[PDB]
Amino acid sequence: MSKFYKIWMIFDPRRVFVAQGVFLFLLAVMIHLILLSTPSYNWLEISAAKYNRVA
Amino acid sequence: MSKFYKIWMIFDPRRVFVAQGVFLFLLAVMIHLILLSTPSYNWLEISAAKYNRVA
Amino acid sequence: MSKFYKIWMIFDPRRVFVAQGVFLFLLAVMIHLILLSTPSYNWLEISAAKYNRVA
Amino acid sequence: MSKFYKIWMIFDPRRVFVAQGVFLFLLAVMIHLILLSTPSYNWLEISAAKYNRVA
Amino acid sequence: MSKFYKIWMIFDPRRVFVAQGVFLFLLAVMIHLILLSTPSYNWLEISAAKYNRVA
Amino acid sequence: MSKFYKIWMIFDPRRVFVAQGVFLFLLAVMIHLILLSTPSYNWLEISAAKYNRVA
Amino acid sequence: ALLSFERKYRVPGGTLVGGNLFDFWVGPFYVGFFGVATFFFAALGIILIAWSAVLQGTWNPQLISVYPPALEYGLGGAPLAKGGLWQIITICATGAFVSWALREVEICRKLGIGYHIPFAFAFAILAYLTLVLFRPVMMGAWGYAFPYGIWTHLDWVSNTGYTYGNFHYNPAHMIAISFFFTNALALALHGALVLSAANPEKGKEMRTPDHEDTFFRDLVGYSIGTLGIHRLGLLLSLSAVFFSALCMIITGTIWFDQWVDWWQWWVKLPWWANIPGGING
Amino acid sequence: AEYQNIFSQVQVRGPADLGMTEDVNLANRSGVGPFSTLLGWFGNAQLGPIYLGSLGVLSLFSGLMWFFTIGIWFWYQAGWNPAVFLRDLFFFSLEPPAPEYGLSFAAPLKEGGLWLIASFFMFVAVWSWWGRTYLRAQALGMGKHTAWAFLSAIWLWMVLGFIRPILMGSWSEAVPYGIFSHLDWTNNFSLVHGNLFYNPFHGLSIAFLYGSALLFAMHGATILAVSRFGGERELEQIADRGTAAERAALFWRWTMGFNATMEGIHRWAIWMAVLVTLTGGIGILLSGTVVDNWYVWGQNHGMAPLN
Amino acid sequence: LGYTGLTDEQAQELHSVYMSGLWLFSAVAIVAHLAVYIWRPWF
Amino acid sequence: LGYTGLTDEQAQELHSVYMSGLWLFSAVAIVAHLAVYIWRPWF
Amino acid sequence: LGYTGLTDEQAQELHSVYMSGLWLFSAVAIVAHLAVYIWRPWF
Amino acid sequence: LGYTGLTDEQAQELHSVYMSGLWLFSAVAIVAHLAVYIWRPWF
Amino acid sequence: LGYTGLTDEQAQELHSVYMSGLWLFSAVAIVAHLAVYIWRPWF
Amino acid sequence: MVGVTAFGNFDLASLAIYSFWIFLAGLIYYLQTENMREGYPLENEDGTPAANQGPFPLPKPKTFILPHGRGTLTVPGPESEDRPIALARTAVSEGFPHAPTGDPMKDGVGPASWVARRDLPELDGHGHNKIKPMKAAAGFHVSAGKNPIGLPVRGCDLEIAGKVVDIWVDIPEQMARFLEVELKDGSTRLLPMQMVKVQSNRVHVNALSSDLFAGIPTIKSPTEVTLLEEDKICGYVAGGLMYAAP
Numbered sequence A, B, C, D, E, F: 001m002s003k004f005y006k007i008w009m010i011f012d013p014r015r016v017f018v019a020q021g022v023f024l025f026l027l028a029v030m031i032h033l034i035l036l037s038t039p040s041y042n043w044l045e046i047s048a049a050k051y052n053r054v055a
Numbered sequence G: 001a002l003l004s005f006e007r008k009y010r011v012p013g014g015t016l017v018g019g020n021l022f023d024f025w026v027g028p029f030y031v032g033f034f035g036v037a038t039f040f041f042a043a044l045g046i047i048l049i050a051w052s053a054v055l056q057g058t059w060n061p062q063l064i065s066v067y068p069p070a071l072e073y074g075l076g077g078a079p080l081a082k083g084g085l086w087q088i089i090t091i092c093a094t095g096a097f098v099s100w101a102l103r104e105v106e107i108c109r110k111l112g113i114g115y116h117i118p119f120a121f122a123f124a125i126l127a128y129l130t131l132v133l134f135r136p137v138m139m140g141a142w143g144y145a146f147p148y149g150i151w152t153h154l155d156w157v158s159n160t161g162y163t164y165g166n167f168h169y170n171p172a173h174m175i176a177i178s179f180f181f182t183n184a185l186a187l188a189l190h191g192a193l194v195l196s197a198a199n200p201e202k203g204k205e206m207r208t209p210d211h212e213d214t215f216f217r218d219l220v221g222y223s224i225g226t227l228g229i230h231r232l233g234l235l236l237s238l239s240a241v242f243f244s245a246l247c248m249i250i251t252g253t254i255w256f257d258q259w260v261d262w263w264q265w266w267v268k269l270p271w272w273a274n275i276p277g278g279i280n281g
Numbered sequence H: 001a002e003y004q005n006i007f008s009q010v011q012v013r014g015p016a017d018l019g020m021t022e023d024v025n026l027a028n029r030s031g032v033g034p035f036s037t038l039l040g041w042f043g044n045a046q047l048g049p050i051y052l053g054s055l056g057v058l059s060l061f062s063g064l065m066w067f068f069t070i071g072i073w074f075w076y077q078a079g080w081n082p083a084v085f086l087r088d089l090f091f092f093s094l095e096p097p098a099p100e101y102g103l104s105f106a107a108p109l110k111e112g113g114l115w116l117i118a119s120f121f122m123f124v125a126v127w128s129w130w131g132r133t134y135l136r137a138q139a140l141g142m143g144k145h146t147a148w149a150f151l152s153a154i155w156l157w158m159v160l161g162f163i164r165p166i167l168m169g170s171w172s173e174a175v176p177y178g179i180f181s182h183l184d185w186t187n188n189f190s191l192v193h194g195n196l197f198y199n200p201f202h203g204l205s206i207a208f209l210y211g212s213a214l215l216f217a218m219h220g221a222t223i224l225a226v227s228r229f230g231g232e233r234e235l236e237q238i239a240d241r242g243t244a245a246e247r248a249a250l251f252w253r254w255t256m257g258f259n260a261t262m263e264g265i266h267r268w269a270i271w272m273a274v275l276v277t278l279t280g281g282i283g284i285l286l287s288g289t290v291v292d293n294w295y296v297w298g299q300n301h302g303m304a305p306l307n
Numbered sequence I, J, K, L, M: 001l002g003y004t005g006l007t008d009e010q011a012q013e014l015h016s017v018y019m020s021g022l023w024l025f026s027a028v029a030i031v032a033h034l035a036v037y038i039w040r041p042w043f
Numbered sequence N: 001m002v003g004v005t006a007f008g009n010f011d012l013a014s015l016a017i018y019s020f021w022i023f024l025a026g027l028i029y030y031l032q033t034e035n036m037r038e039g040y041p042l043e044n045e046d047g048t049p050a051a052n053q054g055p056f057p058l059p060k061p062k063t064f065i066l067p068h069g070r071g072t073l074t075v076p077g078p079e080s081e082d083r084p085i086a087l088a089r090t091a092v093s094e095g096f097p098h099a100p101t102g103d104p105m106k107d108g109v110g111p112a113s114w115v116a117r118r119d120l121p122e123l124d125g126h127g128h129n130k131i132k133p134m135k136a137a138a139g140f141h142v143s144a145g146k147n148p149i150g151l152p153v154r155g156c157d158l159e160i161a162g163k164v165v166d167i168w169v170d171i172p173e174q175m176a177r178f179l180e181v182e183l184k185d186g187s188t189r190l191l192p193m194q195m196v197k198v199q200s201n202r203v204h205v206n207a208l209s210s211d212l213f214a215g216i217p218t219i220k221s222p223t224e225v226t227l228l229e230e231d232k233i234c235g236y237v238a239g240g241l242m243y244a245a246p
């Protein structure tokens, strides 16, 4: 493990950090969208039914 | 934590603030549009129903 | 707060004032369009209903 | 407000005056056309109904 | 066996690391998607049935 | 047998290893898909029947 | 009257047919043996269209419409008022188009330039002959060709298309559209780029081709170059027309059903035809 | 046959070209990419560099979010199944709000709220790319011809997605994001408006579209035919007319009685292509707002026979 | 010292003028929002 | 040291300003979320 | 050494700060998952 | 020596670190599989 | 001599470890087939 | 607004289509007058101004500022050939061909024509010579296709004229512009890359027989070629398509 820091001698940190920022946002967006698309986990619909906010 | 300030030694601050401002604007609009699409959270439709303006 | 002025050593005020001007106008138009598209807040329709001007 | 005249140190008045002129005209035309499209505010149609010109 | 390290005398480690990282994420996503699309292994629907989260 | 090593006088190892890695992965994926397309060897469906996980 | 540089080029020869007999100009227009032919066929076809308007009983040029023979004539000659005029005008059109191309060849020869232009025009001719000749004779009647009339040939396009449902689903037609849209894009970019270099910001020097490369590399990360863009514009245009002719010559000859149904071959590939869900399951 | 100059016989390669500097901020250029020998047969081999300033970050990230939003909707329509995703790919569609929602933003995510979100990302992406075309020209001191030409394409795109829906008063008028669905929308639009062939601006737009293929066939063939004289060095022919430009002019003069110049043919080029979408956007904007049945309109304007 | 070539003195001055524009615009916006909320509450 | 050429002193100053903005922006957002949760709980 | 031109000390310096970000982001994520699990278990 | 320019020592160094990442990733995946198998056996 | 520029001994070196990769790879496969065959014989 | 007419059938769609025709007429007038910046006024075949000049008047002059201190071009402006033209009338009336009075290849007339361009090289964006012999171009090498250097050059008589000794390359556009051919007498010539066909064992020239290669115009310095010299060389080679003997 402890020698992993040499990755910054192979990969330019600027390119990695841009690539990783795009990666983590799109991953996080995808998972939230999956859960919104899921009737058991859409928190907005769950709270609507819980508090009798709709219909 | 305390050494995070060295980010500005590798990234040009002009690019970072642009990329961050772009990100924050697009995210903020996206969330407000999600809430507007959500009947339990569309504040304009909520206030219409609250005040009998929906007619 | 007090050091925020140093942003003008980072960004050219010509570019910033153009970008801000475009942004604020489009945002204002966007919000007025949303409200005109919303029956409970279309001020022309509200006025027409209030004063019995139509139909 | 007293120093707002420095905007002309930053922006060419020729480009500003042209951009402003196009903007104000397009805005004015849009608002009049919205009101002509709005039945309660089409002043020609209001005049016809007022003076019994419709037959 | 233990001469395997000479692979880095042939392959540029940057191109290997990029290729491998793309490969491993796309493979992982592919497998999670196969399981989400498999009714016996969709963990979101399995838990919805276990906890009676619909009906 | 013994002289097969002379293939690396003919073929550059870098190009061969890329082609070989791609070949082996696609061959593996092909065989796994064949088995998944086969009711007697789709392990996910065999599992679902063995544990009565669907209906 | 000459352009100020023109005289040095107006030399004898380069003709395919007729030698010096027709090797002369009428104002700007070079004549040649095929110029005589082109004018005769063009004039005759034009006057026969006007005569067809007399028979039709209209002088509104938007309503003038020369219809091909009814299907009952097959590939035979029809009465002139009942589609035989369309037959003669189609021969005139074909004569004029081919004569025009052959005249361009001898203009190329006199000027010493390549033959790319008449070669490119031959694609347009072959597309025309696809719709009036090759496809009608495969289908066995002249009545499958389009009528010569400004709006009525669009009725033929509409009626032919909806015979096969929404004609967008013809796969060769999709390819042809993509080349047509791509060509118009490339033409706009090419015109704009050359003009933006020749006509810079006020008081600046003309930009070089190096600036043209730089602008496109900066914009999209690639520049095809000054030779490559003219190669591209030609091949995009010709490919659009080639796939246009292909999409029609197969239609009603090897394909007969609603074109939307063709795409089911992909959906019903056996390794996924039966998987539930999606749009087709 | 003799050599036709459609593909190069010999490729040569030298030091990579980093481009002209002018007023470009060189820190925002990437490095040079690889050289494609496959592309080098037809055009330049060099890939890159690319410029990636502030509007480019805005445009690409907004465009990515547009494309990703449609993509995740397609994966949802596929039931997350990779085999179904590839089977039904051209059949998936992100559809605008239904008519009963009008122009409102209250429509549910599945019922067109996601279409609005994607359309917002598209709007920002395209317009910020327009400013990118303008500013890349500015930094090199070039004329803005490319940005103004691109505004004609944006005019049709704006009419389709934004202006006509607002004038018609519902988002349901807009184009769905989907391969076959946008074709189906195209067919449906014509059937609803009583045959779009009788829209005269659609007819003009077709004339300019065909004219663009005609004119680029002519111009491309012409420049290749004079390329033996250096004709494709068009800017130098503009600055110093050679026999290439003279032979090109005289071919068309002797053929059809008139000709262009080496500059002015590109003025024909830009306008021929621009007029496609300029007339296009007018024709669509008139459809349903002013004329709901173009065939009947054509009957009343002397272009179709009366019933 | 920075990328734009504005001095710190110029940057401080420009910011003071800019912020007075921002406060002016936002004050008008605040008054506009209060009037609309008084007229037609959106909560 | 580093790619931008900023001095370590410049980087420390710039970060202190940036973080002052981040904490300001996030404080407003936290107040907004509290007001919305008190108004209309999403859990 | 290195394709990036960083020294070993520079790479080790940078990695220490990157890893502290990764662990902080991971810690927030762990708390988020724990909260969502206690709220609504997915197993 | 090598096409990449990495010396034998540089290749040995790099491989030792790469292989430790490979085994770390493998160990996490093995724990992940083991947990899933106990939760819901596929065989 | 060689199209790769490898010497004879370099080709012997590279081949000797390449074959050990194949033998490792196939040995893992043989265990995989053994386990699968024991689970569900295809003959 | 559907069905709303100002008069008769004059719809808002009618206003649009009539407005477009007026715009298009103006645009076509603009486009044609912009395309009259070269070659006009029209001349009689004796070179005097023609009595007919056509319906479009000439545009106002425009000035291009040329790069690298090459000066200014203003167009339209006084056209002149500034070289002898060895053509004589075949007929007293207009519209007939003008016959060559000597050797049209040597005289540079007909398809052998060349224009009196600047006798300076074309410059790249940095002001270096755009076209250089590849032996002088620092990093340049053949990257794909058959390398032509050292191939024999065959004339269309099927006899060998010489051998290829270098490629001349477009530096900013990175493409082969000419082949330099060493002739039998040991002098060299430039052949345009578009007028040669490279083959596995030869370079074939369809435009010239082997006896014509000596007549290809020479460059005055061995390291650069002027725009004038390019026009002379390219003109002469293409002229061989008409005037090379059977």
Ligand SMILES: CCCCCCCCCCCCCC(=O)OC[C@H](COP(=O)(O)OCC(O)COP(=O)(O)OC[C@@H](COC(=O)CCCCCCCCCCCCC)OC(=O)CCCCCCCCCCCCC)OC(=O)CCCCCCCCCCCCC
Pocket (backbone or CB within 6 Å): D022, G195, G199, G200, G201, G202, H142, H143, H144, H145, H146, H148, H149, H151, H152, H155, H270, H271, H274, H278, H282, N016, N019, N020, N022, N023, N024, N026, N027, N030
């Ligand atoms: C915004 C979305 C909408 C759709 C919008 C679609 C717009 C499409 C425009 C395409 C233009 C391509 C040609 C071109 O050269 O472009 C570059 C040019 C110059 O670049 P530069 O960097 O600024 O300058 C460089 C410098 O060296 C000079 O270069 P150059 O010499 O080449 O420039 C002169 C050109 C440019 O002129 C124009 O572009 C005029 C564009 C007019 C468009 C009108 C179309 C719609 C109206 C028709 C609809 C008709 C149907 C309804 O000169 C010319 O090209 C001259 C053309 C002459 C045409 C004459 C027509 C006369 C007809 C009337 C006759 C009456 C007789 C009694 O740029 C410009 O000059 C600015 C162009 C501005 C475009 C219109 C912007 C939107 C206007 C409307 C909203 C704002 C005003 C209310």
Ligand code: BCL
Pocket (backbone or CB within 6 Å): G157, G181, G184, H125, H126, H153, H154, H156, H157, H160, H185, H186, H187, H188, H189, H190, H195, H196, H197, H201, H202, H205, H206, H207, H209, H276, H277, H279, H280, H281, H283, H284
């Ligand atoms: C049954 C079908 C109907 C019909 C219905 C329609 C409809 C409906 C429309 C047309 C339109 C068009 N029709 Mg019609 N049409 C029919 C029959 C035809 C026939 C024929 C031979 O029968 C032809 C040749 C045409 C021809 C044409 C074109 C002239 C015109 C489109 C121009 C264009 O480029 O658009 C394509 C270009 C654009 C839409 C501009 C796009 C610009 C934007 C900014 C690009 C963004 C890209 C995005 C960000 C992604 C980039 C990703 C990359 C990877 C980077 N039609 C029949 C009668 N037609 C259009 C028009 O203008 O009508 C007047 C239109 O709306």
Ligand SMILES: CC[C@H]1c2cc3[nH]c4c(c3C)C(=O)[C@H](C(=O)OC)c4c3nc(cc4[nH]c(cc(n2)[C@@H]1C)c(C(C)=O)c4C)[C@@H](C)[C@@H]3CCC(=O)OC/C=C(\C)CCC[C@H](C)CCC[C@H](C)CCCC(C)C
Pocket (backbone or CB within 6 Å): G038, G041, G042, G043, G044, G045, G046, G089, G092, G093, G096, G097, G100, G104, G117, G118, G120, G121, G123, G124, G147, G148, G149, G150, G151, G153, G237, G238, G241, H210, H213, H214, H217, H218, H221, H255, H256
């Ligand atoms: C192949 C790629 C594109 C292409 C290329 C192309 N066209 C070309 C050329 C090239 C390279 C020429 O060199 C040549 C030319 O000289 O251009 C100015 C030509 C040309 N392309 C033309 C038109 C044209 N090209 C078209 C298409 C295309 N041309 C393709 C998209 C279209 C359409 C509808 O898409 C048209 C209208 C002409 C301007 C010109 C050919 C002129 C010619 O043939 O002249 C001799 C003939 C006449 C002057 C008139 C003949 C009259 C007939 C005897 C009677 C009419 C019969 C006709 C069938 C009636 C139809 C009625 C309509 C309402 C349907």
Ligand SMILES: CC[C@H]1c2cc3[nH]c4c(c3C)C(=O)[C@H](C(=O)OC)c4c3nc(cc4[nH]c(cc(n2)[C@@H]1C)c(C(C)=O)c4C)[C@@H](C)[C@@H]3CCC(=O)OC/C=C(\C)CCC[C@H](C)CCC[C@H](C)CCCC(C)C
Pocket (backbone or CB within 6 Å): G181, G182, G184, G185, G188, G189, G192, G219, G220, H059, H060, H063, H064, H067, H068, H125, H126, H127, H129, H130, H133, H146, H147, H149, H150, H152, H153, H273, H274, H275, H276, H277
């Ligand atoms: C005058 C009319 C013609 C026209 C002109 C025209 N178009 C133009 C221009 C001009 C003059 C430009 O200047 C501009 C341009 O830049 O051209 C190169 C443009 C352009 N015309 C375009 C397209 C286009 N033009 C078309 C047509 C036309 N263009 C007409 C025929 C058509 C069609 C349907 O006919 C299309 C599709 C673009 C190439 C470009 C405008 C680009 C733009 O606005 O892009 C915004 C979006 C993005 C920048 C990115 C979108 C998302 C991508 C998927 C990228 C993702 C990147 C990410 C890093 C990777 C993610 C991977 C993961 C998801 C796995």
Ligand SMILES: COC(C)(C)C/C=C/C(C)=C/C=C/C(C)=C/C=C/C(C)=C/C=C/C=C(C)/C=C/C=C(\C)CC/C=C(\C)CCC=C(C)C
Pocket (backbone or CB within 6 Å): A003, A004, A005, A006, A007, A008, A009, A010, E027, E030, E031, F025, F028, F029, F030, F032, F033, K002, L010, L013, L014, L017, L018, L019, L020, L021, L022, L025
């Ligand atoms: C259709 O079939 C399905 C999909 C259903 C089933 C079949 C699936 C198949 C066929 C799957 C195949 C999977 C395979 C082939 C997987 C292979 C996985 C491997 C080989 C993974 C390797 C991982 C390695 C890792 C994570 C290594 C990490 C290393 C580091 C982080 C450190 C890198 C080194 C450094 C920093 C040292 C630098 C040193 C110097 C001197 C600069």
Ligand SMILES: COC(C)(C)C/C=C/C(C)=C/C=C/C(C)=C/C=C/C(C)=C/C=C/C=C(C)/C=C/C=C(\C)CC/C=C(\C)CCC=C(C)C
Pocket (backbone or CB within 6 Å): B025, B028, B029, B032, B033, C020, C024, C027, C030, C031, D003, D004, D005, D006, D007, D008, D009, D010, I010, I013, I014, I017, I018, I019, I020, I021, I022, I025
């Ligand atoms: C769908 O989602 C909806 C729309 C419903 C909700 C979403 C809403 C969102 C995301 C809203 C976002 C809003 C934001 C971020 C607003 C930001 C507003 C700002 C920052 C406004 C700033 C205004 C500033 C102004 C007006 C300043 C004017 C300044 C001047 C006039 C003076 C300029 C200085 C000069 C001239 C001095 C020059 C000095 C020298 C030395 C030359």
Ligand SMILES: COC(C)(C)C/C=C/C(C)=C/C=C/C(C)=C/C=C/C(C)=C/C=C/C=C(C)/C=C/C=C(\C)CC/C=C(\C)CCC=C(C)C
Pocket (backbone or CB within 6 Å): F003, F004, F005, F006, F007, F008, F009, F010
């Ligand atoms: C369904 O029924 C169907 C339709 C299929 C019936 C039809 C069947 C047909 C038409 C079958 C056709 C079969 C044929 C034509 C088979 C041919 C097979 C051959 C020729 C196989 C050859 C294999 C050769 C091998 C594996 C050789 C390998 C060699 C090496 C590994 C060493 C290479 C040499 C080296 C390294 C030395 C290098 C030397 C120096 C000095 C460096």
Ligand SMILES: COC(C)(C)C/C=C/C(C)=C/C=C/C(C)=C/C=C/C(C)=C/C=C/C=C(C)/C=C/C=C(\C)CC/C=C(\C)CCC=C(C)C
Pocket (backbone or CB within 6 Å): A025, A028, A029, A030, A032, A033, B020, B027, B030, B031, B034, C003, C004, C005, C006, C007, C009, C010, I002, J010, J013, J014, J015, J017, J018, J019, J020, J021, J022, J025
């Ligand atoms: C997918 O479904 C949904 C969208 C519902 C759920 C998912 C949501 C997701 C994935 C959300 C992700 C959110 C994230 C990652 C948000 C991160 C936000 C951050 C990092 C915000 C930071 C903001 C920082 C600000 C506003 C800083 C401002 C700085 C200033 C005002 C100071 C400016 C002046 C300076 C720097 C001058 C100094 C100059 C010198 C010379 C010293």
Ligand SMILES: COC(C)(C)C/C=C/C(C)=C/C=C/C(C)=C/C=C/C(C)=C/C=C/C=C(C)/C=C/C=C(\C)CC/C=C(\C)CCC=C(C)C
Pocket (backbone or CB within 6 Å): A027, A030, A031, A034, B003, B004, B005, B006, B007, B009, B010, E025, E028, E029, E032, E033, E036, J002, K013, K014, K017, K018, K020, K021, K022, K025
């Ligand atoms: C069901 O849905 C699907 C199908 C999607 C399920 C599958 C999901 C999958 C396949 C998920 C895979 C996830 C993976 C591979 C995630 C990996 C995440 C990683 C690598 C995260 C790393 C995070 C690192 C962070 C947050 C670092 C932050 C750093 C900072 C905040 C400080 C900035 C950097 C500095 C100051 C360094 C510069 C310093 C100096 C001295 C120069």
Ligand SMILES: COC(C)(C)C/C=C/C(C)=C/C=C/C(C)=C/C=C/C(C)=C/C=C/C=C(C)/C=C/C=C(\C)CC/C=C(\C)CCC=C(C)C
Pocket (backbone or CB within 6 Å): E003, E004, E006, E007, E009, E010, F013, F024, F027, F030, F031, F034, L002, M010, M013, M014, M015, M017, M018, M019, M020, M021, M022, M025
């Ligand atoms: C059609 O229907 C189905 C598919 C069901 C039936 C048909 C199946 C068929 C036809 C299957 C065919 C399978 C075949 C032909 C498989 C062959 C596989 C092979 C050849 C695998 C070899 C693997 C080799 C490996 C993993 C080697 C790895 C090597 C290393 C790790 C060493 C790296 C270091 C080196 C080489 C040293 C470098 C030295 C220096 C001095 C720099």
Ligand SMILES: COC(C)(C)C/C=C/C(C)=C/C=C/C(C)=C/C=C/C(C)=C/C=C\C=C(C)\C=C\C=C(/C)CC/C=C(\C)CCC=C(C)C
Pocket (backbone or CB within 6 Å): B033, C030, H067, H068, H070, H071, H072, H074, H075, H116, H119, H120, H122, H123, H157, H158, H159, H160, H161, H162, H175, H176, H177, H178, H179, H182
């Ligand atoms: C592999 O899987 C992943 C997820 C990784 C990637 C896959 C991606 C996929 C499969 C993407 C698919 C993309 C497709 C098929 C795209 C199709 C696009 C088409 C054909 C579009 C056609 C026409 C679109 C038009 C005319 C749109 C015009 C839109 C506008 C003018 C925008 C106007 C703005 C609006 C309506 C927003 C108003 C709202 C606010 C809040 C201002």
Ligand SMILES: CCCCCCCCCCCCO[C@@H]1O[C@H](CO)[C@@H](O[C@H]2O[C@H](CO)[C@@H](O)[C@H](O)[C@H]2O)[C@H](O)[C@H]1O
Pocket (backbone or CB within 6 Å): G073, G075, G076, G077, G078, G087, G090, G091, G094, G132, G133
């Ligand atoms: C590029 C140009 C494309 C268009 C070319 C058109 C060329 C037309 C040539 C026609 C040649 C003569 O064609 C001839 O027509 C007659 C009259 O219809 C056909 O005659 C057919 O119809 C008549 C009645 O209408 C019957 O009496 C007869 O028994 C039947 O065969 C002949 O079978 C056919 O041989």
Ligand SMILES: COC1=C(OC)C(=O)C(CC=C(C)C)=C(C)C1=O
Pocket (backbone or CB within 6 Å): G263, G266, G267, H086, H087, H088, H089, H090
């Ligand atoms: C015939 O129909 C086809 C498809 O869907 C209908 C595809 O998705 C695909 C695959 C995807 C793309 C983007 C071409 C192909 C190749 C195809 O041919």
Ligand SMILES: [Fe+3]
Pocket (backbone or CB within 6 Å): G190, G194, G230, H219, H223, H234
């Ligand atoms: Fe051109």
